[PDB]
Design a protein around this ligand. Structure first.
Ligand SMILES: OC[C@H]1O[C@H](O[C@H]2[C@H](O)[C@@H](O)[C@@H](O[C@H]3[C@H](O)[C@@H](O)[C@@H](O)O[C@@H]3CO)O[C@@H]2CO)[C@H](O)[C@@H](O)[C@@H]1O
Length: 555
């Protein structure tokens, strides 16, 4: 994009497809740019200040925003803007992976405001709940106001309608004062379908394959050095310019790289260079994502493990559609509890292939688990939260299973107080083809009948903030007991199961998960820390008990 250099500013556009490019500074001038042989265009200017707006005009005289824009005040087709530029950052995150309890937030819907300011207003509540890091869904500028974020199209530009650069920086600074970390969801596997102008510039995109969401970045073919650079500088930029704590990488199985060093390893190298954390959403069931270099891995800090969610959801709801077909047994939950992946190199009927690989001795803090998140709610056609799909006891049992697991737990916004509103897929394109495409694709892929482009679809997805006190208090105590029992990262657990029950015993605790009234042989003693109802004894000893449906934590 641009580099401020005392009182001058250098503009750089990578555009090998283009014979000649002009810098257009709105209400100032047009300036010819110098071309190097790799196709970078440069010009250094003296008359540019903060708030100045610009575009680049191409060979065919067409005008485009800066692909590396730091701010798009008028959206994805408007001009780019020069910004404030406080390059101020801590050399370390204070976040410790082992203490991580994550809370996923969609900014537009989290709060009536729908902005960063709205999330600042909730920091005290979040802190008090006991979360240690917030995970922000993508903020790279996308079309309109209503989008999950995965249609982001300007990787360095903070969404205008969320409050732009200033709002986000204020959010992170305020989060830090309250002792909360911020994790940014970033998308390096594709670009959204409206408002991306990189195709006219050079081979940003791979000819080699496609994601379900668009063409993917070119990391390993002709001219890919510069595209690797575009992505790697983006990770550096979020750290230095916004003092962000870490990242959640969208769909790393869709980032394909046959280079000698995988771009995923380089991504982690940048984040580790600045002592930050990265988490990968990976559908590979392959420890290489998370293995250290010495074990041939990319050394990413942790990965999402859908198998854990899927085990719990399928078993508790009886659902078997789509990917749930691969799950549904109690055994699947115990397998994920013991071995992390259910598919650790076993035939998948859903995938029609052998899937995954065992994880070895990696500790629990290489993985993140959840009973809810924006996908497991929002990719449902009716967008239902799991609260609508199981009874109250099972909801509490589910919450306990993940929050007391050895893995890093992630809470979906609202889950903790028993939110009941759906979370739908919504979008805000203005290109009529994409408007028709999204409705038709989403109806077909997801069975979504609400219109993604209809504002009511977004309004309906806003949190109500209607507190179920009994559920909220139950979450708070879970989170606190997790910390006090040193549950985190520790995979040394013993698991016994019968038909309709599970007992899980760690170093300092044991839990009873009674799915259905059962006579159970309890091999341990302890004192009761928390229970989902009042039927469990305060002190229990070794013996046989007939329990009603519920959950209890001892010791
Ligand atoms: O018509 C817009 C777009 O819709 C569909 O793509 C969306 C997916 O339906 C939706 O699930 C979401 O997918 C992202 C996940 O939510 C997220 O966790 C991440 O890891 O990766 C996914 C892609 O980034 O968002 C996409 C994009 O909006 C449809 O498949 C597309 O063809 C269509 O372009």
């Amino acid at each position: 994009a641009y580099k401020i250099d005392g009182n001058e500013v250098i503009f750089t556009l990578w555009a090998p497809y283009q014979k000649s490019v002009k810098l257009k500074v709105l209400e100032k001038g047009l300036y010819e740019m110098e071309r190097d042989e790799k196709g970078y265009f440069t010009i250094t200017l003296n008359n540019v200040k903060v708030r100045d707006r610009y575009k680049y005009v191409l060979d065919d005289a067409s005008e485009i925003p800066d692909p590396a824009s730091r701010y798009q005040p008028e959206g994805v087709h408007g001009p780019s803007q020069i910004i404030q530029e406080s390059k101020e950052f801590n050399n370390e995150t204070f976040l410790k992976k082992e203490d991580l309890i994550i809370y996923e937030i969609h900014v537009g819907t989290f709060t009536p405001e729908g902005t960063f300011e709205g999330v600042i207003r909730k920091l005290d509540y979040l802190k008090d709940l006991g979360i240690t890091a917030i995970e922000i869904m993508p903020i790279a500028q996308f079309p309109g106001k209503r989008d999950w974020g995965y249609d982001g199209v300007y990787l360095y530009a903070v969404q205008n309608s969320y409050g732009g650069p200033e709002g986000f920086r204020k959010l992170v600074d305020e989060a830090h004062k309250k002792g909360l970390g911020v994790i940014l969801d970033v998308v390096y596997n594709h670009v959204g379908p409206e408002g991306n102008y990189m195709v006219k510039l050079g081979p940003y995109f791979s000819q080699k394959y496609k994601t379900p969401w668009g063409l993917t970045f070119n990391f390993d073919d002709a001219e890919s050095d510069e595209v690797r650079k575009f992505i790697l500088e983006n990770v550096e930029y979020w750290i230095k310019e916004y003092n962000v704590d870490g990242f959640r990488l969208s769909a790393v199985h869709a980032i394909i790289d046959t280079s000698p060093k995988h771009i995923l390893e380089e991504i982690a190298d940048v984040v580790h260079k600045y002592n930050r954390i990265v988490i990968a959403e990976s559908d590979l069931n392959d420890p290489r994502v998370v293995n250290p270099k010495e074990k041939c891995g990319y050394n990413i800090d942790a990965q999402w493990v859908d198998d854990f969610h899927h085990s719990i959801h399928a078993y508790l709801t009886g659902e078997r559609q789509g990917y749930y077909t691969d799950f549904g047994n109690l055994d699947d939950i115990v397998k994920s509890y013991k071995d992390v992946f259910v598919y650790d190199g076993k035939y998948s009927n859903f995938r029609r292939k052998t899937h995954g690989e065992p994880v070895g001795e990696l500790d629990g803090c290489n993985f993140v688990v959840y009973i809810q998140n924006h996908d497991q709610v929002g990719n449902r056609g009716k967008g239902e939260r799991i609260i609508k799909l199981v009874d109250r006891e099972s909801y509490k049992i589910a919450a306990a299973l993940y929050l007391l697991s050895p893995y890093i737990p992630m809470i979906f916004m609202g889950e903790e107080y028993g939110e009941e509103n759906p979370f739908y897929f919504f979008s805000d394109f203005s290109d009529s083809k994409l408007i028709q495409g999204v409705r038709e694709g989403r109806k077909k892929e997801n069975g979504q009948d609400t219109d993604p482009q209809d504002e009511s679809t977004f309004n309906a997805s806003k949190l109500s903030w209607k507190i179920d006190e009994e559920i909220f208090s139950f979450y708070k105590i879970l989170i606190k007991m997790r910390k006090e029992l040193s549950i985190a990262c520790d995979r040394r657990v013993n698991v016994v199961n019968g038909e309709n029950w599970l007992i899980i015993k760690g170093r300092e605790y044991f839990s009873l998960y009674v799915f259905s009234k059962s006579s159970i042989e309890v091999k341990y003693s302890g004192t009761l820390l928390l229970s989902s109802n009042n039927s469990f004894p305060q002190h229990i000893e070794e013996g046989k008990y007939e329990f009603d449906k519920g959950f209890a934590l001892y010791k």
